[PDB]
Protein backbone atom coordinates (compact mmCIF):
# COMPACT_ATOMS: atom_id res chain seq x y z
CA UNK A 1 0.00 0.00 0.00
CA UNK A 2 2.85 2.34 0.93
CA UNK A 3 6.03 2.85 -1.10
CA UNK A 4 9.05 4.50 0.52
CA UNK A 5 11.62 6.27 -1.67
CA UNK A 6 14.91 7.49 -0.18
CA UNK A 7 17.41 9.54 -2.22
CA UNK A 8 21.05 10.09 -1.26
CA UNK A 9 22.40 13.42 -2.54
CA UNK A 10 26.01 12.66 -3.46
CA UNK A 11 26.23 15.45 -6.06
CA UNK A 12 26.65 13.40 -9.24
CA UNK A 13 24.48 11.15 -11.40
CA UNK A 14 25.64 7.60 -10.66
CA UNK A 15 24.24 4.71 -12.67
CA UNK A 16 22.13 2.35 -10.52
CA UNK A 17 24.26 -0.75 -11.15
CA UNK A 18 27.46 0.82 -9.82
CA UNK A 19 25.38 2.29 -6.98
CA UNK A 20 24.17 -1.14 -5.88
CA UNK A 21 27.70 -2.53 -6.24
CA UNK A 22 29.16 0.20 -4.05
CA UNK A 23 26.44 0.04 -1.40
CA UNK A 24 27.10 -3.70 -1.22
CA UNK A 25 30.84 -2.99 -0.99
CA UNK A 26 30.55 -0.50 1.88
CA UNK A 27 28.57 -2.85 4.14
CA UNK A 28 30.99 -5.79 3.81
CA UNK A 29 30.98 -7.80 7.04
CA UNK A 30 29.34 -5.32 9.42
CA UNK A 31 25.72 -6.25 10.19
CA UNK A 32 25.48 -9.30 7.89
CA UNK A 33 21.71 -9.52 8.31
CA UNK A 34 21.28 -6.06 6.81
CA UNK A 35 23.43 -7.07 3.83
CA UNK A 36 21.45 -10.26 3.27
CA UNK A 37 18.12 -8.43 3.51
CA UNK A 38 19.16 -5.52 1.28
CA UNK A 39 20.76 -7.69 -1.40
CA UNK A 40 17.66 -9.93 -1.66
CA UNK A 41 19.49 -13.06 -0.53
CA UNK A 42 18.14 -16.39 0.71
CA UNK A 43 18.88 -16.76 4.46
CA UNK A 44 22.19 -18.58 4.72
CA UNK A 45 23.27 -18.03 1.10
CA UNK A 46 24.51 -15.11 -0.99
CA UNK A 47 22.38 -15.99 -4.03
CA UNK A 48 19.69 -13.60 -5.22
CA UNK A 49 16.00 -14.44 -5.55
CA UNK A 50 14.23 -15.00 -8.86
CA UNK A 51 11.06 -13.70 -7.18
CA UNK A 52 10.12 -10.04 -7.52
CA UNK A 53 12.63 -7.98 -5.49
CA UNK A 54 11.30 -5.99 -2.55
CA UNK A 55 14.54 -3.98 -2.57
CA UNK A 56 14.67 -1.38 -5.32
CA UNK A 57 17.40 0.83 -6.76
CA UNK A 58 17.00 3.72 -9.17
CA UNK A 59 19.03 6.39 -10.89
CA UNK A 60 18.30 9.80 -9.41
CA UNK A 61 19.30 12.88 -11.36
CA UNK A 62 21.50 13.92 -8.42
CA UNK A 63 22.48 10.41 -7.28
CA UNK A 64 20.92 7.04 -6.47
CA UNK A 65 17.71 6.18 -4.66
CA UNK A 66 16.41 3.36 -2.46
CA UNK A 67 12.80 2.19 -2.87
CA UNK A 68 10.93 -0.04 -0.42
CA UNK A 69 7.74 -1.90 -1.32
CA UNK A 70 5.16 -2.84 1.30
CA UNK A 71 5.55 -2.89 5.06
CA UNK A 72 8.57 -5.17 4.74
CA UNK A 73 10.16 -2.86 2.19
CA UNK A 74 9.36 0.15 4.34
CA UNK A 75 10.77 -1.53 7.44
CA UNK A 76 13.99 -2.58 5.70
CA UNK A 77 14.61 0.85 4.18
CA UNK A 78 13.87 2.45 7.55
CA UNK A 79 16.40 0.49 9.54
CA UNK A 80 18.84 0.44 6.61
CA UNK A 81 19.23 4.09 5.52
CA UNK A 82 21.10 5.26 8.68
CA UNK A 83 23.68 2.51 8.16
CA UNK A 84 24.30 3.25 4.48
CA UNK A 85 24.37 6.96 5.33
CA UNK A 86 27.04 6.35 7.96
CA UNK A 87 29.06 4.21 5.55
CA UNK A 88 28.85 6.87 2.83
CA UNK A 89 29.95 9.51 5.33
CA UNK A 90 32.87 7.28 6.31
CA UNK A 91 33.98 6.74 2.70
CA UNK A 92 33.50 10.36 1.52
CA UNK A 93 34.99 12.50 4.31
CA UNK A 94 34.79 15.83 2.44
CA UNK A 95 31.26 15.75 1.00
CA UNK A 96 27.88 16.22 2.65
CA UNK A 97 25.43 13.41 1.87
CA UNK A 98 21.77 14.44 2.00
CA UNK A 99 18.83 12.07 2.49
CA UNK A 100 15.37 12.76 1.07
CA UNK A 101 12.56 10.57 2.42
CA UNK A 102 9.20 10.55 0.64
CA UNK A 103 6.33 8.06 0.66
CA UNK A 104 3.88 7.33 -2.16
CA UNK A 105 0.47 5.75 -1.78
CA UNK A 106 0.02 2.90 -4.26
CA UNK A 107 -3.36 2.82 -6.02
CA UNK A 108 -4.65 1.47 -9.33
CA UNK A 109 -8.21 2.33 -10.38
CA UNK A 110 -9.89 1.54 -13.69
CA UNK A 111 -10.90 4.21 -16.20
CA UNK A 112 -12.96 3.70 -19.38
CA UNK A 113 -10.35 5.45 -21.57
CA UNK A 114 -6.57 5.30 -21.81
CA UNK A 115 -3.84 7.67 -20.63
CA UNK A 116 -0.31 8.25 -21.89
CA UNK A 117 2.20 6.41 -19.68
CA UNK A 118 5.90 6.10 -20.52
CA UNK A 119 9.12 4.91 -18.90
CA UNK A 120 12.76 5.85 -19.41
CA UNK A 121 14.13 2.31 -18.84
CA UNK A 122 12.63 -0.88 -20.33
CA UNK A 123 14.35 -4.24 -20.59
CA UNK A 124 12.92 -5.37 -23.93
CA UNK A 125 15.89 -7.01 -25.70
CA UNK A 126 15.36 -10.78 -25.55
CA UNK A 127 16.24 -11.98 -29.06
CA UNK A 128 17.86 -10.01 -31.87
CA UNK A 129 15.12 -11.17 -34.25
CA UNK A 130 12.44 -9.49 -32.13
CA UNK A 131 14.51 -6.29 -32.10
CA UNK A 132 13.89 -5.73 -35.82
CA UNK A 133 10.24 -6.78 -35.38
CA UNK A 134 9.49 -3.34 -33.89
CA UNK A 135 9.05 -1.88 -37.39
CA UNK A 136 5.58 -3.47 -37.54
CA UNK A 137 3.39 -2.86 -34.49
CA UNK A 138 1.41 -6.10 -34.85
CA UNK A 139 4.40 -8.46 -34.68
CA UNK A 140 6.09 -6.72 -31.74
CA UNK A 141 2.97 -5.95 -29.71
CA UNK A 142 2.41 -9.49 -28.42
CA UNK A 143 5.57 -9.93 -26.36
CA UNK A 144 5.66 -6.30 -25.21
CA UNK A 145 2.05 -6.27 -24.01
CA UNK A 146 2.53 -9.68 -22.41
CA UNK A 147 5.61 -8.40 -20.59
CA UNK A 148 3.76 -5.32 -19.34
CA UNK A 149 0.75 -7.33 -18.16
CA UNK A 150 2.81 -10.01 -16.40
CA UNK A 151 5.03 -7.39 -14.76
CA UNK A 152 2.03 -5.41 -13.52
CA UNK A 153 0.20 -8.46 -12.18
CA UNK A 154 3.28 -9.89 -10.45
CA UNK A 155 4.20 -6.58 -8.81
CA UNK A 156 0.57 -6.15 -7.73
CA UNK A 157 0.55 -9.63 -6.20
CA UNK A 158 3.85 -8.85 -4.48
CA UNK A 159 2.40 -5.65 -3.00
CA UNK A 160 -1.11 -7.08 -2.57
CA UNK A 161 -2.88 -4.30 -4.49
CA UNK A 162 -6.23 -5.06 -6.17
CA UNK A 163 -6.21 -4.62 -9.95
CA UNK A 164 -9.16 -4.74 -12.37
CA UNK A 165 -9.70 -7.92 -14.38
CA UNK A 166 -10.07 -6.13 -17.73
CA UNK A 167 -6.79 -4.31 -18.42
CA UNK A 168 -5.84 -3.97 -22.09
CA UNK A 169 -2.74 -2.06 -23.21
CA UNK A 170 -1.48 -1.03 -26.65
CA UNK A 171 2.06 0.16 -27.30
CA UNK A 172 3.04 3.42 -28.99
CA UNK A 173 6.83 3.35 -29.20
CA UNK A 174 10.07 4.55 -27.68
CA UNK A 175 12.53 7.38 -28.29
CA UNK A 176 15.79 5.48 -28.70
CA UNK A 177 18.10 2.72 -27.54
CA UNK A 178 21.03 2.53 -25.13
CA UNK A 179 23.76 0.14 -24.00
CA UNK A 180 24.54 -0.93 -20.44
CA UNK A 181 27.31 -3.07 -18.97
CA UNK A 182 28.09 -4.83 -15.70
CA UNK A 183 31.43 -3.02 -15.36
CA UNK A 184 33.17 -0.41 -17.54
CA UNK A 185 35.60 -3.08 -18.76
CA UNK A 186 32.88 -5.67 -19.43
CA UNK A 187 32.22 -6.67 -23.04
CA UNK A 188 28.62 -7.82 -22.41
CA UNK A 189 25.85 -5.30 -23.06
CA UNK A 190 22.07 -5.21 -23.33
CA UNK A 191 19.61 -2.96 -25.18
CA UNK A 192 16.90 -0.91 -23.50
CA UNK A 193 14.29 1.60 -24.58
CA UNK A 194 13.87 5.24 -23.55
CA UNK A 195 10.41 6.79 -23.60
CA UNK A 196 8.54 3.53 -24.15
CA UNK A 197 4.98 4.87 -24.39
CA UNK A 198 2.03 2.56 -23.76
CA UNK A 199 -1.60 3.42 -23.02
CA UNK A 200 -3.56 1.73 -20.23
CA UNK A 201 -7.24 2.18 -19.34
CA UNK A 202 -6.55 2.65 -15.63
CA UNK A 203 -4.97 5.08 -13.19
CA UNK A 204 -1.59 4.36 -11.59
CA UNK A 205 -0.91 6.25 -8.35
CA UNK A 206 2.57 6.66 -6.94
CA UNK A 207 5.73 5.17 -8.39
CA UNK A 208 5.49 1.95 -10.36
CA UNK A 209 7.63 -0.84 -11.77
CA UNK A 210 7.40 -2.55 -15.16
CA UNK A 211 9.43 -5.17 -16.98
CA UNK A 212 11.72 -7.57 -15.12
CA UNK A 213 15.15 -7.48 -13.46
CA UNK A 214 14.40 -4.31 -11.56
CA UNK A 215 16.81 -4.38 -8.60
CA UNK A 216 19.74 -3.30 -10.76
CA UNK A 217 17.76 -0.15 -11.53
CA UNK A 218 15.59 -0.80 -14.59
CA UNK A 219 11.87 -0.45 -15.11
CA UNK A 220 11.11 2.17 -12.43
CA UNK A 221 8.81 5.04 -13.34
CA UNK A 222 6.68 7.62 -11.51
CA UNK A 223 3.36 7.27 -13.31
CA UNK A 224 1.80 9.88 -11.01
CA UNK A 225 4.31 12.59 -11.91
CA UNK A 226 4.02 11.75 -15.62
CA UNK A 227 0.28 12.47 -15.56
CA UNK A 228 1.17 16.08 -14.73
CA UNK A 229 2.60 16.30 -18.26
CA UNK A 230 5.87 18.05 -17.39
CA UNK A 231 7.73 16.47 -20.35
CA UNK A 232 7.27 19.62 -22.43
CA UNK A 233 10.43 21.27 -21.05
CA UNK A 234 12.90 19.22 -23.11
CA UNK A 235 14.83 21.46 -25.50
CA UNK A 236 18.13 23.27 -25.97
Amino acid sequence: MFVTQVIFNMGERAYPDRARAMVAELMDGVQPGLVATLMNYIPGTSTSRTEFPTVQFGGASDGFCLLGFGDGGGAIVRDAVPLIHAALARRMPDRIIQVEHKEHSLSAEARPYVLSYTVPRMVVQKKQRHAERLLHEAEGKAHLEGLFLRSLQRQAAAVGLPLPENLEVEFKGAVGNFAAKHNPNSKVAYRGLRGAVFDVNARLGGIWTAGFMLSKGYGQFNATHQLSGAVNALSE
Binding site: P82, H85, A86, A89, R95, I96, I97, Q98, V99, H101
Partner: peptide, 14 residues
Amino acid sequence: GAQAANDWITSLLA
Protein backbone atom coordinates in the same frame (compact mmCIF):
# COMPACT_ATOMS: atom_id res chain seq x y z
CA GLY B 1 32.96 19.35 9.76
CA ALA B 2 30.97 17.23 7.35
CA GLN B 3 31.51 14.09 9.43
CA ALA B 4 29.94 15.67 12.51
CA ALA B 5 27.15 17.17 10.40
CA ASN B 6 26.31 13.77 8.94
CA ASP B 7 26.43 12.23 12.41
CA TRP B 8 23.95 14.84 13.62
CA ILE B 9 21.67 14.23 10.64
CA THR B 10 21.76 10.49 11.36
CA SER B 11 20.78 11.23 14.95
CA LEU B 12 17.94 13.38 13.61
CA LEU B 13 16.65 10.56 11.41
CA ALA B 14 17.13 7.96 14.15
